[PDB]
Coordinates of C-alpha atoms in Angstrom, one line a residue:
Chain A
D214 CA 195.0 27.5 42.0
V215 CA 193.4 27.6 37.7
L216 CA 194.7 30.2 34.8
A217 CA 191.6 29.3 32.8
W218 CA 189.5 27.0 31.7
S219 CA 187.0 25.4 29.5
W220 CA 183.9 23.5 29.1
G221 CA 180.9 22.9 27.1
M222 CA 178.1 20.4 25.7
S223 CA 176.4 20.4 22.8
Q224 CA 172.3 19.7 21.8
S225 CA 171.9 17.0 19.3
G226 CA 167.6 17.9 18.2
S227 CA 166.9 19.8 15.9
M228 CA 163.2 21.7 14.9
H229 CA 163.5 21.8 11.3
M230 CA 161.5 18.5 11.8
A231 CA 164.7 13.8 19.3
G232 CA 168.0 14.3 20.3
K233 CA 170.0 13.3 23.5
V234 CA 173.0 16.5 24.9
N235 CA 176.3 15.5 25.1
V236 CA 178.0 17.3 28.1
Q237 CA 182.1 17.7 27.1
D238 CA 185.1 16.9 29.9
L239 CA 186.0 20.4 31.5
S240 CA 189.3 22.2 30.6
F241 CA 191.5 24.2 33.6
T242 CA 195.0 25.2 33.4
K243 CA 196.6 25.1 36.7
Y244 CA 200.6 25.6 37.5
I245 CA 203.1 22.5 38.4
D246 CA 202.0 21.5 42.0
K247 CA 201.8 19.3 44.7
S248 CA 198.8 17.9 43.4
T249 CA 200.1 16.9 39.8
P250 CA 201.1 13.9 41.2
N251 CA 198.3 12.8 42.9
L252 CA 196.4 13.6 39.4
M253 CA 198.4 11.3 37.7
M254 CA 197.6 8.2 39.5
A255 CA 194.4 9.3 39.9
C256 CA 194.9 9.4 35.8
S257 CA 196.2 6.5 36.1
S258 CA 194.4 4.1 37.9
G259 CA 191.4 5.9 37.4
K260 CA 189.4 5.8 40.6
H261 CA 187.9 8.5 40.9
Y262 CA 186.5 10.3 43.0
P263 CA 183.5 11.5 45.5
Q264 CA 183.2 15.8 44.2
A265 CA 185.3 18.4 42.7
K266 CA 184.0 22.6 43.4
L267 CA 185.4 25.1 40.4
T268 CA 184.8 28.0 42.1
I269 CA 185.2 31.8 39.8
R270 CA 185.4 34.8 42.1
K271 CA 185.2 37.9 41.2
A272 CA 188.4 40.4 41.4
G273 CA 189.3 42.1 44.9
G274 CA 189.8 39.2 47.6
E275 CA 188.1 36.8 50.2
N276 CA 185.3 39.1 50.5
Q277 CA 184.4 39.4 46.9
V278 CA 180.9 37.2 45.8
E279 CA 182.4 33.7 44.8
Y280 CA 180.2 34.4 41.6
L281 CA 180.4 31.2 39.1
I282 CA 180.5 28.0 41.2
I283 CA 180.5 24.7 39.0
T284 CA 180.1 21.7 41.0
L285 CA 180.6 17.7 39.6
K286 CA 180.6 14.2 41.7
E287 CA 182.1 11.2 40.8
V288 CA 185.4 13.2 39.0
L289 CA 187.4 10.8 36.8
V290 CA 190.7 12.9 35.5
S291 CA 190.7 12.3 32.2
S292 CA 193.9 13.7 30.5
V293 CA 196.6 15.3 31.9
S294 CA 198.7 17.6 30.0
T295 CA 202.8 19.4 31.4
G296 CA 205.4 20.5 30.2
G297 CA 207.5 24.4 30.6
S298 CA 210.5 25.8 28.4
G299 CA 213.1 28.0 29.3
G300 CA 212.0 31.4 29.8
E301 CA 209.4 30.6 31.9
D302 CA 209.9 30.7 35.7
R303 CA 206.9 28.9 36.5
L304 CA 205.5 25.5 35.0
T305 CA 202.0 24.8 33.7
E306 CA 199.6 21.7 32.9
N307 CA 195.8 21.4 31.5
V308 CA 194.2 18.8 33.3
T309 CA 190.4 17.7 32.0
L310 CA 188.1 15.6 34.6
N311 CA 184.9 14.0 33.0
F312 CA 182.1 13.1 35.6
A313 CA 179.0 11.7 35.9
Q314 CA 176.4 14.7 37.7
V315 CA 177.0 18.5 37.2
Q316 CA 176.1 21.4 39.1
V317 CA 176.7 25.2 38.3
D318 CA 175.1 27.5 39.7
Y319 CA 175.5 31.9 39.3
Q320 CA 175.2 34.4 42.0
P321 CA 173.5 37.8 40.0
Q322 CA 174.8 40.8 41.6
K323 CA 173.7 44.7 41.8
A324 CA 175.3 47.6 40.6
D325 CA 176.4 48.4 43.9
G326 CA 178.6 44.5 44.3
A327 CA 176.1 43.4 46.9
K328 CA 173.8 39.9 45.8
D329 CA 171.0 40.8 43.8
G330 CA 168.9 37.8 45.6
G331 CA 170.0 33.8 45.7
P332 CA 172.0 32.1 42.9
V333 CA 170.8 30.6 39.3
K334 CA 171.3 26.9 39.3
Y335 CA 171.3 24.3 36.9
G336 CA 171.4 21.1 37.7
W337 CA 171.9 17.5 35.8
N338 CA 172.6 13.9 35.9
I339 CA 174.7 12.8 32.5
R340 CA 175.1 9.4 33.7
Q341 CA 171.6 9.1 34.1
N342 CA 170.6 11.3 31.2
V343 CA 167.8 13.7 33.5
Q344 CA 167.6 16.7 35.6
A345 CA 169.6 16.7 39.0
Chain B
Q13 CA 175.1 69.9 45.0
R14 CA 172.1 71.1 44.1
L15 CA 169.0 72.9 46.3
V16 CA 165.0 72.4 45.1
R17 CA 162.1 73.7 45.4
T18 CA 159.5 71.2 47.4
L19 CA 156.0 71.6 45.9
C20 CA 153.1 72.4 48.6
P21 CA 151.8 69.4 49.9
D22 CA 148.6 71.6 50.2
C23 CA 148.1 72.1 46.0
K24 CA 150.4 70.5 43.6
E25 CA 148.6 68.7 41.0
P26 CA 148.7 64.7 40.1
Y27 CA 149.4 63.8 36.2
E28 CA 150.6 60.8 34.0
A29 CA 153.8 61.8 32.2
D30 CA 155.2 61.5 28.3
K31 CA 157.0 59.3 26.7
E32 CA 159.3 62.0 26.7
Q33 CA 159.5 62.8 30.3
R34 CA 158.8 58.8 31.1
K35 CA 162.1 58.0 29.2
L36 CA 164.3 60.5 31.6
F37 CA 163.0 57.8 34.5
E38 CA 152.3 50.8 35.0
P39 CA 150.7 54.1 36.5
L40 CA 153.9 56.4 36.4
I41 CA 152.2 60.2 38.1
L42 CA 154.4 63.0 38.4
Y43 CA 153.4 66.5 40.2
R44 CA 152.7 70.0 39.0
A45 CA 153.9 73.6 40.2
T46 CA 150.1 75.8 40.1
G47 CA 149.5 78.1 42.9
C48 CA 147.0 79.1 45.2
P49 CA 146.5 80.5 49.2
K50 CA 149.0 79.0 51.1
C51 CA 150.4 78.6 47.7
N52 CA 151.4 82.2 47.1
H53 CA 150.8 82.1 44.7
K54 CA 154.0 79.6 43.2
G55 CA 153.8 75.7 42.8
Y56 CA 156.2 76.3 46.5
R57 CA 157.1 76.3 49.2
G58 CA 160.1 75.5 50.8
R59 CA 163.1 73.9 49.9
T60 CA 165.4 70.2 50.1
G61 CA 168.5 69.0 49.0
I62 CA 168.9 67.0 46.0
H63 CA 173.0 65.2 45.9
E64 CA 176.1 63.2 44.0
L65 CA 179.2 62.0 46.2
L66 CA 181.7 60.6 44.4
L67 CA 183.4 59.2 46.7
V68 CA 187.4 58.1 45.6
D69 CA 188.5 54.6 45.8
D70 CA 190.8 52.3 44.6
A71 CA 189.3 52.7 40.8
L72 CA 189.3 56.4 41.7
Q73 CA 193.2 57.2 43.0
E74 CA 194.4 55.8 39.0
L75 CA 191.9 57.7 37.7
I76 CA 193.0 61.0 38.9
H77 CA 197.6 59.7 39.5
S78 CA 197.6 59.0 35.5
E79 CA 195.6 61.7 34.0
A80 CA 192.7 59.9 31.9
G81 CA 190.3 62.8 32.0
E82 CA 186.5 63.9 32.5
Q83 CA 185.1 61.1 30.0
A84 CA 186.7 58.4 30.8
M85 CA 186.6 59.3 34.4
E86 CA 182.7 60.6 34.2
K87 CA 181.9 57.4 32.5
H88 CA 183.8 55.1 35.5
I89 CA 182.0 57.1 38.1
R90 CA 179.0 56.3 36.7
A91 CA 179.5 52.8 36.9
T92 CA 179.4 53.4 41.3
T93 CA 177.8 56.3 42.0
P94 CA 174.1 57.6 41.1
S95 CA 173.7 60.8 39.6
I96 CA 172.5 65.0 40.4
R97 CA 170.1 64.2 38.5
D98 CA 169.2 60.6 39.3
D99 CA 168.6 61.8 43.2
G100 CA 165.8 64.2 41.7
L101 CA 164.8 62.4 39.6
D102 CA 163.9 59.9 42.8
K103 CA 162.1 63.1 44.7
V104 CA 160.4 63.8 41.7
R105 CA 158.7 60.3 42.1
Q106 CA 157.9 60.7 45.8
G107 CA 156.1 63.8 45.3
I108 CA 158.7 66.5 47.1
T109 CA 160.1 68.4 43.5
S110 CA 158.4 68.8 40.4
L111 CA 160.7 67.7 37.5
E112 CA 160.4 71.1 35.7
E113 CA 163.0 72.0 39.4
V114 CA 164.7 69.4 38.8
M115 CA 165.8 70.0 34.9
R116 CA 166.3 73.8 36.1
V117 CA 169.4 72.9 38.3
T118 CA 170.4 70.5 36.7
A119 CA 179.9 50.4 18.1
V120 CA 176.7 48.9 17.6
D121 CA 174.8 48.3 19.8
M122 CA 173.6 44.4 20.3
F123 CA 170.3 42.6 22.8
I124 CA 168.4 38.8 22.7
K125 CA 166.1 38.0 24.3
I126 CA 165.2 34.8 24.4
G127 CA 161.4 33.8 26.1
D128 CA 161.2 34.9 29.0
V129 CA 165.0 34.0 30.2
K130 CA 166.4 37.3 31.9
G131 CA 169.8 38.7 31.8
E132 CA 171.9 41.2 33.0
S133 CA 171.1 44.5 31.1
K134 CA 171.7 47.7 31.4
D135 CA 170.0 49.0 28.8
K136 CA 167.2 51.1 28.9
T137 CA 164.7 50.3 26.3
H138 CA 166.2 46.4 25.9
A139 CA 166.7 45.5 30.4
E140 CA 166.8 42.5 31.7
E141 CA 167.9 41.1 28.0
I142 CA 171.5 38.9 27.4

């Protein structure tokens, strides 16, 4: 269960005169659950997973539209930051993810809520620095 | 619900709408009343209904309970349900009733357009922008 997330990229090229893209690691917040030790093991050992898929979905339930799906391939666990306080009932932790490739699929919707056409795709191989 | 007189199909006049008329709703032709022997001698014969179906869902059940108000409730209603006028204007496009008949019974905004990339703006002028 993802409580929050943050991810970005930056282009060094300028129009005042080429550059290169710098894709950041995908950070996300989560509760301390049964996956916590496995992510710490992956971060410590440095063994990457074949795929990691972040899924965002509209408010309502399971039948609502998954309007943003970020798929990652060859994914390391770059860092794990955990902790807690005396007032919290459920403790949380931040986890960052380094990856070779990335695929973002946004699904547009109409006013009523139905899917407006197909999903708009963005794919990029960061390792080879090309489109995917 | 409102009723609107139906333009007689034998004698109605096609005309391109002006700017103020086009703002209500690429040759957009509407139709005018006129008058004639079946038309006898007005621009209409018969009628049809135009509607606006408010459907009370989970969001509207709160607004009624907590007393948000007509305005706040009207704002959420326009997000989901089409208006009375919009249902009438669709029939004007189809060529059933006139625009005269539908009307009688009836913080800074910021947008950006990057090349030919389409966004999701609901604005009338700045449509499909970011």
